[PDB]
């Protein structure tokens, strides 16, 4: 049993295993105290497991939000940083509210940052949104694209129905069976 | 694009100059 990743995180190790079990190779998660987890595979599956590490770019990075670049713990903050932290808290709250609809498993919302409106005498521009969603299969997902557009429409100042773009898709086929150890 | 079934002129706070030009064809 050769190792290929160590010093990982609890959230990262549950994703490397889910990628490897999809492609018929079995991995083992091993705890090491405060030094994190480690993932070991068998001997004949070593040539394929490095190929799916390189292809799927594993381990994952922590997901980035715009509010991390402008911390609230600073002493003095610009209005360009306070408006950028406000739009990043609205953008996370609409994403956490889209997962509570009927059939949505995951969602992701983006928003236009009109950050240079108050610097000059030009009026501020209209705002744009763009959302993704993953629906549970078995649903006719053509009619679900108007409920998200009606929900996102009058949740802001003045958007139009052609300034919102929704790209959604059904989920993949389920993986319920064990991979299986190679015989030797 | 303009859903009304009949024929007529709808004025939402006109100013009696724009209005009488709509009657200037009848």
């Amino acid at each position: 049993d050769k190792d290929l990743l160590k010093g990982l995180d609890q959230e990262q190790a549950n994703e490397v295993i889910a990628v490897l079990q999809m492609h018929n190779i079995e991995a083992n998660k091993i705890d090491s105290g405060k030094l994190g987890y480690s993932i070991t595979v068998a001997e004949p599956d070593f040539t394929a497991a490095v190929y799916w590490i390189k292809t799927y770019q594993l381990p994952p990075r922590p997901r980035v939000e715009i509010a991390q670049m402008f911390p609230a713990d600073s002493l003095v903050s610009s209005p360009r940083a306070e408006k950028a932290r406000l739009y990043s808290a609205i953008e996370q709250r609409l994403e956490q509210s889209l997962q509570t609809m009927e059939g949505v498993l995951s969602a992701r919302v983006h928003i236009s940052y009109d950050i240079d409106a108050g610097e000059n005498g030009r009026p501020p521009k209209p705002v744009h949104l763009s959302a993704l969603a993953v629906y549970e299969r078995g649903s006719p997902l053509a009619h679900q694209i108007s409920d998200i557009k009606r929900f996102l429409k009058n949740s802001f100042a003045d958007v139009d129905y052609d300034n919102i773009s929704v790209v959604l898709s059904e989920r993949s086929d389920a993986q319920l069976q064990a991979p299986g150890t190679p015989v030797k | 694009k303009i859903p009304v079934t009949g024929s007529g002129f709808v004025a939402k706070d006109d100013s009696l100059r724009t209005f009488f030009d709509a009657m200037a064809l009848q």
């Binding site: 299969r137 006719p140 009619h143 108007s146 009606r150 129905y161 | 303009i2 724009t18």
Partner: protein, 221 residues
């Protein structure tokens, strides 16, 4: 360890049908009970062979088989209310098969489903398939626009609908696709913002929209 006891406590939501190719079929009725019954056969606590059938995934499988060996066919659904004898809702005014070719089709459809004793092919009228879609759409007070063409119709719902109207349209489309399916009549709900909220306009033969006290818009018909 029989299969009807390896499922849950409630022995009502599943129905185990013996097959002809020596295989047991578990007939669920939605996706939550389908993944509930596929987890049992996937974790391996059953020795013999078993499959989990569904209303939809069996309806999309004999429609993959159907448009290779029997192309240019006009049909609506396959109804599985009694799974040992399904009903095949065929069209009447769009195909001219004789009584022998309907028996050959009723034997080749029986050979695909090993749990079915026979297939009941019923021909159905084509005018009431669109009359039931228009008389149910006029009842819900929805604006629509019928587009008849050869071999299917299409209803287009446009405008700036509110929240009551986009919930009454979705409950009717979902309650109509269950019975007839999206083979003949197609619905299309698209919603857009209204240009004339605070504007003054003239309607009728010569129609125009006043976007300002000094601005005219002449929409093309």
């Amino acid at each position: 360890a029989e299969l009807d006891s390896l499922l849950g406590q409630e022995k009502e939501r599943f129905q185990v049908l013996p097959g002809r190719d020596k295989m047991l079929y578990v007939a669920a009725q939605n996706e939550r009970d389908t993944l509930w019954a596929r987890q049992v056969l996937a974790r391996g606590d059953y020795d013999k062979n078993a499959r989990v059938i569904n209303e939809n995934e069996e309806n999309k499988r004999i429609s993959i088989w159907l448009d290779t060996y029997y192309p240019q066919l006009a049909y609506y659904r396959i109804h599985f209310d009694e799974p040992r004898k399904p009903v095949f809702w065929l069209s009447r005014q769009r195909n001219t098969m004789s009584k022998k070719e309907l028996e050959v089709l009723s034997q080749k459809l029986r050979a695909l489903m090993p749990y079915a004793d026979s297939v009941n092919i019923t021909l159905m009228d084509d005018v009431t398939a669109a009359g039931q879609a228009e008389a149910g759409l006029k009842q819900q007070a929805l604006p629509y626009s019928r587009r008849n063409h050869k071999g299917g119709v299409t209803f287009v719902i446009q405008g700036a609908l509110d929240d009551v109207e986009i919930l009454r349209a979705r409950q009717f489309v979902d309650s109509y696709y269950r019975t007839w399916g999206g083979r003949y009549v197609q619905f299309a709900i698209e919603l857009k913002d209204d240009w004339l909220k605070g504007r003054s306009f003239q309607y009728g033969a010569e129609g125009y929209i006043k976007m300002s006290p000094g601005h005219w818009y002449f929409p093309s018909p």
